[PDB]
Subunit: 291 residues, 6 copies
């Protein structure tokens, strides 16, 4: 980015202006996972983009996952799994490990990366200041709803206390664990938690970092790649999508139907994908709007 | 506490008044460890006492340890230790485990206990919002200062951001990990960190929960138990004390010399020891003042 | 309270916690009269309990009476009384004396007692900053409503200005005099004024200090002493109660029906009765709730 | 004021402008006593002028006396006086009467008069919120300093809490009683208290209402009437002035030497003397400045 | 105003009190034009009266015209006019001159005059901070509505930003130019703009300075001069009034019907007419109220 | 900017981050003149860049000139000039025209351009709220200091009121006219005024838009173009520079010596020069630092 003429650098920056205006002073919830979480270059760029948003007066809120790190630690601890369908059962023991890995390892890495740019990141779970609660969820397997232990969905969100934190200039980094109404902590799917946080905070956008170019309606036909789709059309397409994309699409559906103006499935394998999706018209991601 | 006449219950409460006046609106830093951390009755009472202080308009700040929980997890993970003197060397690997256990397990338990009473507790480390930094420390072994890895002392404290948190009505629960000036996270001894936080926050008291009645000057002579001692006298006595008491005494010395009006070594095996030490004249603990 | 074991002192304090949580940040209106007002030990303890509430972050508001002090001063001044039924007629002259005694003597004593603990108490009447107004009341005598001069009921309350005063950390001590809509100051019964202030301020509790154990439904049968009663049941019982208890019961009825969660008739002859009633389950008083 | 041409009414108002600019947002302490306190027309006009200042964004603070009302009440109560020199001895009994008359009668009348114009006036003594303290004073009689009981001078003033009250839009009406360092309430001379309040509050002016045209240097020579004098000249003249003027002059001296820009001795027998002195160049009063 | 006795000066000031109470803390919009704008004595007095209101805690907002100054500058620039009916057509060129004269000359003179008394005046147009917008208006000529270029009516007003300016202690001086919805700046009649600003700001009064004694219903019969009239009566009279008075009357109608409590047509040829109309009962102006 | 690969657009934006961090929450004063003021494309881009800074949480303050527009209007009005040396004498008449052109024409155009992006721009002069004052300046001609009328330098700046305006989210657009201590308005050179505003506001940068690539030390040698120079070196070079560059260089000297961290002479003929200079390392401008 050095031989590139200076009048072209100017145009690239100037074209950010309409999106800076759209997002100034607004909440943007970003689900962070996949290869954006595992490669040092993609990670460092993600943390820089969070600092970028913050130094534009945008209020990012990061919700992270960590499925494979949990599995890796359970295997290290010799904790034998129980599986119903394709789901590990989250016993009290598995929860303790999940919480310890998500909050004490995965979230720590991102907090420190972001904080290389300033005193921005702060880690939290639903446990802290009772910021949100969980309700136990069942899963459908072989056509029957089934209990797989201490896993849940976001129940209620302390919207005011959460926005107080971003008003202090902080970037919350959320590990998806929260107590139920009896104080018993559950693990929440990070994609669904991200949609719930976006709706509760009145976010202007929900970004979903995934390891794909975007939503293909007829995978693997390359021409089936769509760049914008409405919730009604997308809900009808949901039964036909691969297993990995369903939670990302359900998230976008719940968020946009919940009033979030747009949710985006963007390619987490692209360095600075957040900057590309937010401040550029050239993203490969797909945008979900209501309709 | 039922056959006890009602006019005696009244006198007990009324005698709390001078200490409520002393502490209203003031910061009290509490080092929490030992059996107060491991027994369910002592723990639940500790969490209730933190809620008590908060519902009196006192601002508690909890600094916790977790030495044995770390050791237990290292053994579970099969991480062979290296030892210089009696000190485990904190390699990058051992740090990751220490941080994950302290922040993702030990701190979580206390946060949830306290939060059974309200949205009070919030967990943090020096990493979050760069709340404090560490400087690597050496230890003296066989008369020579020696490096034992990523262990440090508190360097600087973001006093303003920390007090903003208690001003929100929060009870910080601090896990003693913090980055050095290069962003590399160190493990800090919880006793020393507690003294450093007390001094930086202008705390009115530092409480040190330990598993002993109090400071014995000539252990094990029962009559050597003292109830108040000045920093000058206590510094001269420090070379003669058992190994377990030195860090607790050094903490009290640094805090009180640092301007904290008093530091207290109190018996963490007594249910509601905090209430006893703060709102009663009948504590067995020992009080350190400057002189 | 010295030979009493330390673990019992701890339990007494710890059992205050649920009521500290209930009252933190809340308004508590206390009608103060009777022997609690005349004996030096009961008085000093009352003032200490007001300071106690204030140093817990509770907002006490004190409404005081002074019937007998007024009578005593009228006799000293040689002011001959006029009586309709059992009621002294409050001429302009009698009002001046009542106001001067209530505000310039009785209220002064309590303000100074409370202020021995800090800059808390502040005296006021409805006259000051037009904090409340009066409407002239008649009384029923021999079955006919009758004018007995410048006596009234609370008309309107400047809720906002009153709460601004407690927000400053002040403890208002209210002498029950207030202007009517024409600026003419009336004397208001202190029991009824206390209920009116409680309702207007959204108080969490109304305490009525009286010189009896509590409400007896069939005085003097000792077993008729009740510890909790609903407003509907109590309204039906009101025509059967002794003359001294009627104003205290009407007060509790108006307050609780007015939305105050509970009103309490407690024994003002018990040292620290406020502490006993608020922070203990062993009070002899009776609690009024809606039903 | 009806046949007077309209262009003359305009000029009178327009000439108020430089003094409105001088006083906007500033504290003005007014000592109120004499015939301005006893005649219904002068009183009602005084209260209106206090409302005038308040509705210009000026912050009046009223300090009142009441010597003769106290004497009258003592005689009504049959309280025999003890006299040293020309001074009544203020026994505990005489204090109670003084406080009750000053705060519960004299201050009440002014509060109600002012409040006919709005929720402005609020009565206070040094007792309330420990707004100020007293130190016992002796008097010189026949050349020897002598104790005459519970009479004092203002010791310390809670400047911040007092200015908080005027910031709320209130007009404090101060009765000059205050506790000493042991909580024992003393009666303070109202002229001296007014000067002390002016200095502590950083008042822009001190007004002293008296029943004379102004300072005569060689009473009763009519030409000895001066309209402005400096503190140095006036201090030298003080030993030669009549008994009634000394406290008013000592007050002006202490205030202006204390940094109050000017103190004024104005004729309280003139209806609306405050308006005349503050917003007009035609006052008969005398102005004291430093020099 | 020197031989006039001092007790008469006092009465004049004291009679201002009810209107100071009415206006304290309230917005007063003043249309300023005519001879009040062109004579140095009337101008300087107008600026002083704006400073007077400000130093009483009243919030004046000045809307100014400048018709003849515009004409004079157009003639100096040799800009030939086009006229439909009696209306100059406001071409883009004529607008530039109008804006430059109104904002860069006429408004500057008033700002500087007012600012001789303090940092009060601040000049603005609808362009600044998009404080208000315009909508293009047509005029009726020979019975047909006709376009006369870039002239409009106030469309929307940024009420909040405007009141923020007066809350800072500023006196806005408004030049009536504002952009339409496409950013194209229009010239707005100053009388109509003044009524629109008064209604949008919730003004307590609208003052209309004109070069006449007041509204004559049957000009030139001297007895037809009315001092107060309701909007319904005045609307019926509007078709019968001289050409110069129609815009002033339409303004008062729109304002008072828009909820402004009263609008006043006052004689701008009287020195200090504002002071006379606001703080005196002797104004020759006419008051419009709803009915 | 369309065929350019998306990973290059990302890198351009990401490289803005260190300068966004440097400028977030900081004041940047921009002198705007030259061709950046006269060409529609350069102007519209300048206004967009001001909106860009504002939507990043940067606080721009624009100081504008307008020399040639003034000359053009004087010629249109037939105002014959008087010239001493090469300086037009600013008579009272010439000032009125200068003020009317600068504030009522030139500043209006920029305000409206900026406001196409939001309610940002607000026009002001030193006259408004007495935001700054002028002191009359002389010029040196043929070796003698000479009066050329109502031209001056910035004297004092109301730093607090000016920063209150940018705190409201406003972008001040300053026309360089201000009253002297006697209220007489002077015209101030816009380059010098810009440096004075930067120093008084504690600006982080001063940008000087000019119609040259940057400072040439040995014009017209192309290799004499420097990209960074210290104040000491640059002061020594000042006597050797062309006439047009002297005011721009004196400005940078006064600002940087006045404590402004850096002042920049940048090429106003480059579209989006502000974006290029601030958020890019590829600017042709020259940076002045202290040394």
């Amino acid at each position: 980015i050095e031989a590139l003429p200076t009048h072209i650098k100017a145009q690239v920056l100037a074209e950010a202006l309409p999106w800076l205006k759209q997002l100034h002073g607004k909440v943007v919830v970003v689900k962070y996972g996949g290869n954006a979480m595992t490669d040092d270059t993609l990670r460092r760029a993600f943390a820089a983009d969070m600092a970028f948003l913050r130094n534009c007066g945008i209020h990012p809120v990061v919700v992270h996952g960590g499925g494979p790190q949990i599995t890796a630690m359970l295997r290290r601890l010799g904790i034998e799994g129980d599986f119903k369908g394709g789901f590990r059962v989250t016993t009290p023991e598995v929860l303790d490990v999940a919480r310890m890995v998500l909050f004490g390892q995965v979230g720590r890495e991102l907090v420190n990366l972001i904080n290389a740019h300033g005193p921005y990141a702060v880690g939290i779970t639903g446990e802290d200041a009772q910021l949100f609660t969980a309700v136990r969820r069942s899963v459908t397997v072989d056509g029957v709803a089934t209990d797989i232990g201490l896993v849940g969905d976001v129940d209620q969100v302390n919207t005011a206390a959460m926005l107080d934190l971003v008003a202090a200039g902080r970037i919350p980094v959320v590990s998806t664990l929260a107590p139920d109404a009896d104080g018993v902590v559950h693990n929440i799917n990070a994609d669904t938690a991200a949609a719930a946080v976006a709706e509760a905070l009145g976010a202007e956008k929900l970004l979903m970092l995934t390891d794909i170019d975007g939503l293909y309606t007829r995978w693997p036909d390359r021409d089936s790649l769509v760049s914008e789709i409405d919730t009604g059309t997308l809900a009808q397409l949901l039964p036909t999508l691969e297993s990995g994309m369903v939670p990302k699409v359900e998230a976008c559906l719940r968020a946009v139907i919940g009033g979030v103006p747009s949710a985006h499935i963007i390619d987490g394998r692209v360095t600075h994908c957040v900057l590309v999706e937010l401040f550029t018209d050239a993203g490969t991601g797909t945008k979900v709007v209501r309709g």
